[PDB]
mmCIF file of C-alpha atoms and ligand atoms in Angstrom:
data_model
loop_
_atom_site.group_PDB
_atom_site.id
_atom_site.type_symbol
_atom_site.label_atom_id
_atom_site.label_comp_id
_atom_site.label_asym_id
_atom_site.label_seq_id
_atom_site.Cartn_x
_atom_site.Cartn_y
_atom_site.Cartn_z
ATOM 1 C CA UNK A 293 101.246 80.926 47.601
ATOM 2 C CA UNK A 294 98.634 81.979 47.961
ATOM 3 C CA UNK A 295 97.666 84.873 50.085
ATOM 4 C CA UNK A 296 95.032 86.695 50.011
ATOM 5 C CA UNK A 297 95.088 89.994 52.283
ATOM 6 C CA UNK A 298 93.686 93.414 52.194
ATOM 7 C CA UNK A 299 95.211 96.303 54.385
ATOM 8 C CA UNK A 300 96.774 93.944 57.220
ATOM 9 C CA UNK A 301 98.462 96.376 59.582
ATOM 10 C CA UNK A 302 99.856 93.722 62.159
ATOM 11 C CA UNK A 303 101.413 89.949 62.177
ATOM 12 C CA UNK A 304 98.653 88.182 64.060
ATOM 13 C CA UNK A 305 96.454 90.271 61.024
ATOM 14 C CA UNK A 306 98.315 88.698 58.751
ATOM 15 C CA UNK A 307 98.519 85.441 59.813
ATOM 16 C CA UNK A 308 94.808 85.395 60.140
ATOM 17 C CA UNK A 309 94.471 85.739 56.305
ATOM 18 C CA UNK A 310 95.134 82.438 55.583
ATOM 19 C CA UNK A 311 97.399 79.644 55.927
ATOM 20 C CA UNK A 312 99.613 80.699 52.842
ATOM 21 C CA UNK A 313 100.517 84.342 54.236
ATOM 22 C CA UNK A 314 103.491 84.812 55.898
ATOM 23 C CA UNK A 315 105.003 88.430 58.134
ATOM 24 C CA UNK A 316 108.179 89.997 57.437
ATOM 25 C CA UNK A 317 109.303 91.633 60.579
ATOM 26 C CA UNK A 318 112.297 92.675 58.901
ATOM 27 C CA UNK A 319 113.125 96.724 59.791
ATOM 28 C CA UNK A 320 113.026 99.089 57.218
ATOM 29 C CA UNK A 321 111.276 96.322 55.049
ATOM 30 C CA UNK A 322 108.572 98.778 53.379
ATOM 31 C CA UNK A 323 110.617 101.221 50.935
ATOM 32 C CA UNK A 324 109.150 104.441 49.889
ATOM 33 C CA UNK A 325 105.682 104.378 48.944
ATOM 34 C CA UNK A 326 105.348 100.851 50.208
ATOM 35 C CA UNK A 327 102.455 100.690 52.946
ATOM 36 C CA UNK A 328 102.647 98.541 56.081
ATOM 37 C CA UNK A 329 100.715 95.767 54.155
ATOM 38 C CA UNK A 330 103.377 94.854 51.831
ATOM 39 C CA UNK A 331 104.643 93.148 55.001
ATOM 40 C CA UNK A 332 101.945 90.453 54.375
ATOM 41 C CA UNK A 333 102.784 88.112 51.967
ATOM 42 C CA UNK A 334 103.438 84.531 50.748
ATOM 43 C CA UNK A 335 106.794 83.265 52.018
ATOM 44 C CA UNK A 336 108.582 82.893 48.487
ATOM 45 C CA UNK A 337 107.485 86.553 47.892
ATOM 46 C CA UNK A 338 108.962 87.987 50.896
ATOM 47 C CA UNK A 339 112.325 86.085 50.473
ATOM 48 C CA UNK A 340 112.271 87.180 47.492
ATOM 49 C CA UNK A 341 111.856 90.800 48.250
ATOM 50 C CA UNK A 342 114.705 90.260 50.340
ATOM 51 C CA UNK A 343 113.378 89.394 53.931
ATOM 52 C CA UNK A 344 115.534 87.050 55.768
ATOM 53 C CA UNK A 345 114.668 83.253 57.155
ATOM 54 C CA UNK A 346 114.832 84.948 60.753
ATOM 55 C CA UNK A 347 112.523 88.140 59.774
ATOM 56 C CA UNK A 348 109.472 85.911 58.401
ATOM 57 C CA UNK A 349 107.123 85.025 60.866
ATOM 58 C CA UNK A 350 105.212 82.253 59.890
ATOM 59 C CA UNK A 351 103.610 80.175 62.783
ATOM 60 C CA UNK A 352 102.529 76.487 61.788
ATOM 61 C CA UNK A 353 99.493 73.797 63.184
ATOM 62 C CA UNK A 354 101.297 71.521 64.621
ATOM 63 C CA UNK A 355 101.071 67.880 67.272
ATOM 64 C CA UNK A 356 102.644 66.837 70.381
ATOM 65 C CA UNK A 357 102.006 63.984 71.430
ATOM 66 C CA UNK A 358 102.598 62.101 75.139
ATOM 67 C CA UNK A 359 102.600 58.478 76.119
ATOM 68 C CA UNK A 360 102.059 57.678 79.365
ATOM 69 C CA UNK A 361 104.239 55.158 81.573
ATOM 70 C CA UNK A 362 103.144 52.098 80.940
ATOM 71 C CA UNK A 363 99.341 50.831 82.055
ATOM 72 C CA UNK A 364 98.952 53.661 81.652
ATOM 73 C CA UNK A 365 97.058 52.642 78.488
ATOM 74 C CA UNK A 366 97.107 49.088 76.633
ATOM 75 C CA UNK A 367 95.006 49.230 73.674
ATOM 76 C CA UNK A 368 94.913 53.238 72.477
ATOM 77 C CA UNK A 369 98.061 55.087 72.397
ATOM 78 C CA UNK A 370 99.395 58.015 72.213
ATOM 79 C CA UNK A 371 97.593 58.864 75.315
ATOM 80 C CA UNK A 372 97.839 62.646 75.212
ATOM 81 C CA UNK A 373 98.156 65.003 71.879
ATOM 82 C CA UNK A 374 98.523 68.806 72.452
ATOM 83 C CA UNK A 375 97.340 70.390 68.973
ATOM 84 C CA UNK A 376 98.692 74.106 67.842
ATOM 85 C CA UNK A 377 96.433 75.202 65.467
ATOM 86 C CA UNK A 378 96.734 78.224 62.895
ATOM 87 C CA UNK A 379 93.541 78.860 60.709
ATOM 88 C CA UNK A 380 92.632 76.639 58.024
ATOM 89 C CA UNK A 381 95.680 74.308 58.327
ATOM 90 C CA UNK A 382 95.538 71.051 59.347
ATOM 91 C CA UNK A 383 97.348 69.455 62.301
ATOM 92 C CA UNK A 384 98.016 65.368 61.359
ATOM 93 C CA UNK A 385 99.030 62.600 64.075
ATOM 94 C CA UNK A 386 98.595 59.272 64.536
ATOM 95 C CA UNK A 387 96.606 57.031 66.403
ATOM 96 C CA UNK A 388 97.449 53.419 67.193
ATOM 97 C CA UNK A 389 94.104 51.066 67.909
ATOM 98 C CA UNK A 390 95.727 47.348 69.391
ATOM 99 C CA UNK A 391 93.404 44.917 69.650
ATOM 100 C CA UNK A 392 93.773 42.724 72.952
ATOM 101 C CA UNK A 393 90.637 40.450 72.304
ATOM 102 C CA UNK A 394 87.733 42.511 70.800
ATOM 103 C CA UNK A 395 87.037 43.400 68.307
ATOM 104 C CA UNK A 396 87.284 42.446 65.030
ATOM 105 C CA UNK A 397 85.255 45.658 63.776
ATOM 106 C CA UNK A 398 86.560 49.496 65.147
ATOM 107 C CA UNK A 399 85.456 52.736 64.721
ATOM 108 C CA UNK A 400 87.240 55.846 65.936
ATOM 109 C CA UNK A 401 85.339 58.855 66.977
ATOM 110 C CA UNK A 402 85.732 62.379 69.202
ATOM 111 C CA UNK A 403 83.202 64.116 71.152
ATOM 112 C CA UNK A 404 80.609 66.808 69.635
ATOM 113 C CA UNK A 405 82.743 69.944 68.889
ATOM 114 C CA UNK A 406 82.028 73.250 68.229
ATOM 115 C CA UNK A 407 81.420 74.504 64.388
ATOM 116 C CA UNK A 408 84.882 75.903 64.253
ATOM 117 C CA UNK A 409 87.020 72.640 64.306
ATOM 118 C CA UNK A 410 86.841 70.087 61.299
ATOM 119 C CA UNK A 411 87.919 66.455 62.339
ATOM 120 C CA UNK A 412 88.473 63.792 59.987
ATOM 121 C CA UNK A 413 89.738 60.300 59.646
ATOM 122 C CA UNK A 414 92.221 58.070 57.689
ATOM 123 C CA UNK A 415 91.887 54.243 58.676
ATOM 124 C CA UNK A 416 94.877 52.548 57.508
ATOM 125 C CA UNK A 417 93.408 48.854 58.413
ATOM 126 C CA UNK A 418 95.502 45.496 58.330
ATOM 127 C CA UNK A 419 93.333 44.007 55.601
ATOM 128 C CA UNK A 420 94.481 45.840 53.895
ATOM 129 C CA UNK A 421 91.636 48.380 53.150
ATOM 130 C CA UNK A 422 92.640 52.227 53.374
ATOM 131 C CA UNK A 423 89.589 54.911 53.642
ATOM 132 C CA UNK A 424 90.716 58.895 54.125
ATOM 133 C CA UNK A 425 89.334 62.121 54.900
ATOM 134 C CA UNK A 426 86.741 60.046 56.852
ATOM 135 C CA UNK A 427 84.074 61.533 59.430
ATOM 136 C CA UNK A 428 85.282 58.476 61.720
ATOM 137 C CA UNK A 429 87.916 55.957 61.977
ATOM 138 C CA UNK A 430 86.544 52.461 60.335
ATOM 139 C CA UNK A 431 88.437 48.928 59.812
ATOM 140 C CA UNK A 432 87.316 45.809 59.382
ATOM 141 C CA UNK A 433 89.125 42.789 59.882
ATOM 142 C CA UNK A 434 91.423 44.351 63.090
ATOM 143 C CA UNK A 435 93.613 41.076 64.854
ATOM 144 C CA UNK A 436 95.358 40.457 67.946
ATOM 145 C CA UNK A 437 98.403 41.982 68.477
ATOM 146 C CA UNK A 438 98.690 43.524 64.616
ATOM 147 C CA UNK A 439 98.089 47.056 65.606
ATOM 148 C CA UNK A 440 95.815 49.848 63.047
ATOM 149 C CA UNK A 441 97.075 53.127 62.582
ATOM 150 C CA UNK A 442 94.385 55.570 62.052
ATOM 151 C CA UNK A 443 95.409 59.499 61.048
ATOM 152 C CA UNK A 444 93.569 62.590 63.136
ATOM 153 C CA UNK A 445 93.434 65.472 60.857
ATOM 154 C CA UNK A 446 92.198 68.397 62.820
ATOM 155 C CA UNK A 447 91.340 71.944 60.947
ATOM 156 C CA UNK A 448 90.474 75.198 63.139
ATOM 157 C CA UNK A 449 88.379 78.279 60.790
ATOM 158 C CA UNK A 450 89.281 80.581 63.056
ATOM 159 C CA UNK A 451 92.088 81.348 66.130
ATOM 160 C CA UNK A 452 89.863 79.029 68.867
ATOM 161 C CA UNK A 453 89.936 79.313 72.772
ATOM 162 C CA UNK A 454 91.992 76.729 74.122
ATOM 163 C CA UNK A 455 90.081 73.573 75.052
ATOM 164 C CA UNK A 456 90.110 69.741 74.914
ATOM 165 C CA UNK A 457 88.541 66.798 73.823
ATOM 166 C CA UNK A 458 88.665 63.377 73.271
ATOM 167 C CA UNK A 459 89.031 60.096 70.684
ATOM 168 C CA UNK A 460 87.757 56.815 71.662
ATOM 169 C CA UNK A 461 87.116 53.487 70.026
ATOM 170 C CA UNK A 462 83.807 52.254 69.666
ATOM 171 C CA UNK A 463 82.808 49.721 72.840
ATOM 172 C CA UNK A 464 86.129 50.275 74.366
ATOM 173 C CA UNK A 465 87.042 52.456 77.720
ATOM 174 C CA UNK A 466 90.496 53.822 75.844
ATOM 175 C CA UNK A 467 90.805 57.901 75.864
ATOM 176 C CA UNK A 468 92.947 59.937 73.584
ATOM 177 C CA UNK A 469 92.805 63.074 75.457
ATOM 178 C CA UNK A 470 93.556 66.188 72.937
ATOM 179 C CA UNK A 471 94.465 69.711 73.545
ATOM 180 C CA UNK A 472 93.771 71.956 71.542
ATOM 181 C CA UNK A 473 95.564 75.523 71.630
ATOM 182 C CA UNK A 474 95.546 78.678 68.718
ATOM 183 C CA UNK A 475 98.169 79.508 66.795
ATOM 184 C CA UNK A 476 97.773 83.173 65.753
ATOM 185 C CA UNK A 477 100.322 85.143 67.461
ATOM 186 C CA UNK A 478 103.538 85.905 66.409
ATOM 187 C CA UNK A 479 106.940 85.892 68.053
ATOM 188 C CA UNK A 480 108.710 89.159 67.166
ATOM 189 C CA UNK A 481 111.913 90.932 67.887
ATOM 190 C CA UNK A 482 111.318 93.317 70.436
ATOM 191 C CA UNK A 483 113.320 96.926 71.042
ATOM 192 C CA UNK A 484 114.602 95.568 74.318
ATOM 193 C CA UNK A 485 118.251 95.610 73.499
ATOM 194 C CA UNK A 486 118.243 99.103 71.253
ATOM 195 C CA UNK A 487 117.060 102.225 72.422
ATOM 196 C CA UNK A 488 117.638 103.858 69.053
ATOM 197 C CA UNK A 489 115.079 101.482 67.390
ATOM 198 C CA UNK A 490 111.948 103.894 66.380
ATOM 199 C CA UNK A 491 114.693 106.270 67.026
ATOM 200 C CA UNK A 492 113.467 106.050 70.590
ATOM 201 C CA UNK A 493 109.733 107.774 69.777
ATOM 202 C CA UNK A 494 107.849 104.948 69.202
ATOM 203 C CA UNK A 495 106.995 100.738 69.932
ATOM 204 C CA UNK A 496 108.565 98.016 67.530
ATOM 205 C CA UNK A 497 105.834 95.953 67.261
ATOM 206 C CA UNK A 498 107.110 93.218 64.173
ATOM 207 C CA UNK A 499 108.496 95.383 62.110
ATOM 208 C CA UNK A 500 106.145 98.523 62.228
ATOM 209 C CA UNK A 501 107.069 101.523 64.245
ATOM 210 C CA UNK A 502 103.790 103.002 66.266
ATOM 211 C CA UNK A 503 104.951 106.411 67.252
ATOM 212 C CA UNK A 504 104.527 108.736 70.550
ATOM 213 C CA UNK A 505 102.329 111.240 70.371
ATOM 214 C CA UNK A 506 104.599 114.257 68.204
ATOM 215 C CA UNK A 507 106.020 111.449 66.201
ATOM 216 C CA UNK A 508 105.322 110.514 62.647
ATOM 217 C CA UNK A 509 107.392 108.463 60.069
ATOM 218 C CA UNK A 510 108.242 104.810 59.458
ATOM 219 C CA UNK A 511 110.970 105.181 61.914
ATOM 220 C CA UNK A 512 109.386 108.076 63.860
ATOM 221 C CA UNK A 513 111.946 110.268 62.524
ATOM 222 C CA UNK A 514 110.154 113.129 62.185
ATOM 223 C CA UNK A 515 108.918 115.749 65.201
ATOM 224 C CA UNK A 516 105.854 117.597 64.306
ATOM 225 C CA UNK A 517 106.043 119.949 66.627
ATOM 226 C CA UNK A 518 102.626 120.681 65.872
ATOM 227 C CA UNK A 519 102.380 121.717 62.383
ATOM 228 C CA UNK A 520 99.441 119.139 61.736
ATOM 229 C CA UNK A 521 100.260 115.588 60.166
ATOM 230 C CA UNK A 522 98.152 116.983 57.641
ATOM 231 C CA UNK A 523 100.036 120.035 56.659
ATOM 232 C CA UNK A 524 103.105 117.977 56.754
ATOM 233 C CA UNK A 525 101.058 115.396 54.252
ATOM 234 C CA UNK A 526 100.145 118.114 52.213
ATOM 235 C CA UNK A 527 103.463 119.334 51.116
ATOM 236 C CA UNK A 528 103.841 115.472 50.039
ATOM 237 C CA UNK A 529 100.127 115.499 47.323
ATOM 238 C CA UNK A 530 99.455 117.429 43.926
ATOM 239 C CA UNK A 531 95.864 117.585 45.137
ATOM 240 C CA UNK A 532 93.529 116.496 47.929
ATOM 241 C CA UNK A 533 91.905 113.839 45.584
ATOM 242 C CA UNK A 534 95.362 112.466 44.526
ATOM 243 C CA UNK A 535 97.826 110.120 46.397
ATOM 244 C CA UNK A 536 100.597 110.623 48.741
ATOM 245 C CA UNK A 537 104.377 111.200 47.081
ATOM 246 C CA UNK A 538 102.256 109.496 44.122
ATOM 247 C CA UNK A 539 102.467 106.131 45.207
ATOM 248 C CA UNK A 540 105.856 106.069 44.681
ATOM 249 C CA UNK A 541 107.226 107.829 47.832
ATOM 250 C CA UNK A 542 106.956 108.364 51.602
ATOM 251 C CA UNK A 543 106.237 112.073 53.183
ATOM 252 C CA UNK A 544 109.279 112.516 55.229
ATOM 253 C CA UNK A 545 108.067 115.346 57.649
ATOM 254 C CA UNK A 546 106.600 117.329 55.137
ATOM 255 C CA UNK A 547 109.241 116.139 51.896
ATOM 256 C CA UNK A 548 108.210 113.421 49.534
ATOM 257 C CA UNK A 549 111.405 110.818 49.470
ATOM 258 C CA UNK A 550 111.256 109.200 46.179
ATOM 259 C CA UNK A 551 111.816 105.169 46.108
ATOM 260 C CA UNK A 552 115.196 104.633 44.547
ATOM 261 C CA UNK A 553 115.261 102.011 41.612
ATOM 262 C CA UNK A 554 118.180 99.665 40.763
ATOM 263 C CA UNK A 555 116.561 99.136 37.339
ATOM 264 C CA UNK A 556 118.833 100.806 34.301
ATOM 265 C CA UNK A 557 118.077 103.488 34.054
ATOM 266 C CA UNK A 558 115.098 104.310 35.962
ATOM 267 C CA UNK A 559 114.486 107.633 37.906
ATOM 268 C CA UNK A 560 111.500 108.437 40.261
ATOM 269 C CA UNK A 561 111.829 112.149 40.414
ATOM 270 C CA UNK A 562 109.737 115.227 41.025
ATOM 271 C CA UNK A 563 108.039 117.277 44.442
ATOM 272 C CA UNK A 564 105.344 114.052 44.554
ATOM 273 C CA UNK A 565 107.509 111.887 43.021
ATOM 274 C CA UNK A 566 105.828 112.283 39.837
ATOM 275 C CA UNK A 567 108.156 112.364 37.162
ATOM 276 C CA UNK A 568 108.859 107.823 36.018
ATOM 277 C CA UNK A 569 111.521 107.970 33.857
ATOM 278 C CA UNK A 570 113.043 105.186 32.147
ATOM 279 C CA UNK A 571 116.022 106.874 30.394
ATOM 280 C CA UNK A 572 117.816 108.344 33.176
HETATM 281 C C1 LIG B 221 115.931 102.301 59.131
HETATM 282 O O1 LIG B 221 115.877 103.440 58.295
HETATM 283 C C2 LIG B 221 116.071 104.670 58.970
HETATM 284 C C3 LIG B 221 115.969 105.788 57.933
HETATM 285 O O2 LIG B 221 115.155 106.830 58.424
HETATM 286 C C4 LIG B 221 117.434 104.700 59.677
HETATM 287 O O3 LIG B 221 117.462 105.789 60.578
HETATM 288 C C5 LIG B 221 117.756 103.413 60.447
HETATM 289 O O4 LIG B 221 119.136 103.372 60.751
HETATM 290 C C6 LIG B 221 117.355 102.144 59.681
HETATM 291 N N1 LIG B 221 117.490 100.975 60.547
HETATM 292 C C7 LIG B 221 117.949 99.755 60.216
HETATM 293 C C8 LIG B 221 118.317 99.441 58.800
HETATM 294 O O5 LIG B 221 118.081 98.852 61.044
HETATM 295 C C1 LIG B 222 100.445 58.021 60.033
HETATM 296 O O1 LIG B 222 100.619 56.699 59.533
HETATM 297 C C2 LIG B 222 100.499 56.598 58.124
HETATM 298 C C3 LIG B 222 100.460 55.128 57.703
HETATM 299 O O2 LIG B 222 101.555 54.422 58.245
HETATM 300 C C4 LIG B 222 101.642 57.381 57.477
HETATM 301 O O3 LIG B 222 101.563 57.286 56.073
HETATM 302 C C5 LIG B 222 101.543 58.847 57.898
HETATM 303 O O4 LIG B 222 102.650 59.577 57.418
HETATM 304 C C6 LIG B 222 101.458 58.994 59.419
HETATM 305 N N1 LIG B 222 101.114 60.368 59.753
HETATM 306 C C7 LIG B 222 101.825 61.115 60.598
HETATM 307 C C8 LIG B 222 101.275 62.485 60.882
HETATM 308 O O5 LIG B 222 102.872 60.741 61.133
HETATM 309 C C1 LIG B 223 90.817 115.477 51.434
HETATM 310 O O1 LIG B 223 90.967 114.154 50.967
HETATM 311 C C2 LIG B 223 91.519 113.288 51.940
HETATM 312 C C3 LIG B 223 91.882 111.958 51.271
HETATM 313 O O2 LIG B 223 91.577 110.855 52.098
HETATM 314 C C4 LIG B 223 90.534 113.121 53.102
HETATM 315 O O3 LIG B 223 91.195 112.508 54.189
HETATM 316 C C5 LIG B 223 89.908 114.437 53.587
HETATM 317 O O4 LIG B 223 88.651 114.139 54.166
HETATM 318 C C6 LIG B 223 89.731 115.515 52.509
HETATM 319 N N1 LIG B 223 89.704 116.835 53.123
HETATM 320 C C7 LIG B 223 88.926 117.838 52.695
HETATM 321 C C8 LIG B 223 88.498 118.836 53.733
HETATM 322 O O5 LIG B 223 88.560 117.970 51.525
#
């Protein structure tokens, strides 16, 4: 928790919600009368709906960091950070300030960047003050050969362009070079090693079957053969005003197939799948 979506038809969709929503790839996921959407949800939800630690996509910000040789770099380290960044969650790592003669006084600082990345600074100083959620790094009382710690928190608002920039100490020719890349696309199971997937009429793209042309259906199950998608819907809803296999169902070429319930002793029958009974 929490995630807040609203008809998310795709991972990257979903993921792009917020930092709390989380895409079940899992086949077959959406019942009947579940919409694609239901895919989109909080991780403890979908788990819970029964989608499986390998089915939930869930990319994560994330640091790398590289130190190089040695001189190389005396007084800043680590010397390179790569940043993976999903929208509106932070990416923390660490920055090590040693003093070699100056200065008793340092601030930590980046480059102007643009209005979609947040920076801020903790200064965990030797004196021992602490400050947090900072604008820049600050300590007083930095010695010789004690080393500072100061932690980059770094927040994208939306999936960026990959680009880089830099952290520096106040007065000193140090350079924490950062790259910074998005993380909004998911990794998804593919129907490379099934041809039967989509039952061979459509792409698996996370989950959701996108149908050839002739092809309708979660699964692309069903040939229309061109009575219209709409005729076929039609057979599935009471009236034009009025929802398809009432909420409860999906229109399998032209049939309403009820969602089954596991609930004592529940029933979803009826032509639209109108009929809720609870004493079945
Ligand atoms: C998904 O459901 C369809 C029902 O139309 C079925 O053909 C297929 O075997 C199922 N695939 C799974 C569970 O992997
Ligand atoms: C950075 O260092 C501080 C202070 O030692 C520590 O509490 C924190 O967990 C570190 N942060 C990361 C991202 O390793
Ligand atoms: C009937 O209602 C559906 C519901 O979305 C809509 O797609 C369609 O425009 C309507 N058709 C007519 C001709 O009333």
């Amino acid at each position: 928790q929490e995630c807040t979506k609203f008809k998310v038809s795709s991972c990257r969709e979903c993921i792009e919600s917020g930092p709390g929503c989380t895409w079940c790839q899992k086949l077959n996921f959406t019942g009947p009368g579940d919409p694609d959407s239901i895919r989109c949800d909080t991780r403890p939800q979908l788990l819970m709906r029964g989608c499986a630690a390998d089915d939930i996509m869930d990319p994560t910000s994330l640091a790398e960091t590289q130190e190089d040789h040695n001189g190389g770099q005396k007084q800043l380290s680590p010397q390179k950070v790569t940043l993976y960044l999903r929208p509106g969650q932070a990416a923390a790592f660490n920055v090590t300030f040693r003093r070699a003669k100056l200065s008793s006084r340092v601030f930590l600082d980046h480059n102007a960047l643009p209005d979609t990345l947040k920076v801020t600074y903790d200064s965990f100083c030797s004196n021992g003050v602490t400050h947090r959620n900072q604008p820049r790094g600050d300590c007083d009382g930095v010695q010789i050969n004690v080393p500072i710690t100061f932690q980059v928190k770094v927040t994208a608002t939306e999936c960026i362009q990959e680009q880089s920039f830099v952290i520096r100490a106040l007065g000193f020719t140090d350079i924490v070079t950062v790259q910074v890349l998005p993380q909004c696309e998911c990794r998804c199971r593919d129907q490379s090693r099934d041809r039967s997937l989509c039952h061979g009429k459509g792409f698996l793209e996370c989950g959701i079957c996108r149908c050839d042309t002739g092809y309708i259906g979660k699964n692309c199950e069903c040939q229309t053969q061109g009575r219209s998608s709409q005729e076929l819907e039609g057979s599935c809803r009471k009236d034009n005003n009025s929802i398809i296999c009432s909420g409860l169902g999906d229109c399998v070429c032209g049939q309403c197939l009820c969602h089954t319930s596991d609930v004592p002793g529940k029933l979803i029958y009826g032509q639209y799948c109108e009929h809720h009974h609870h004493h079945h």
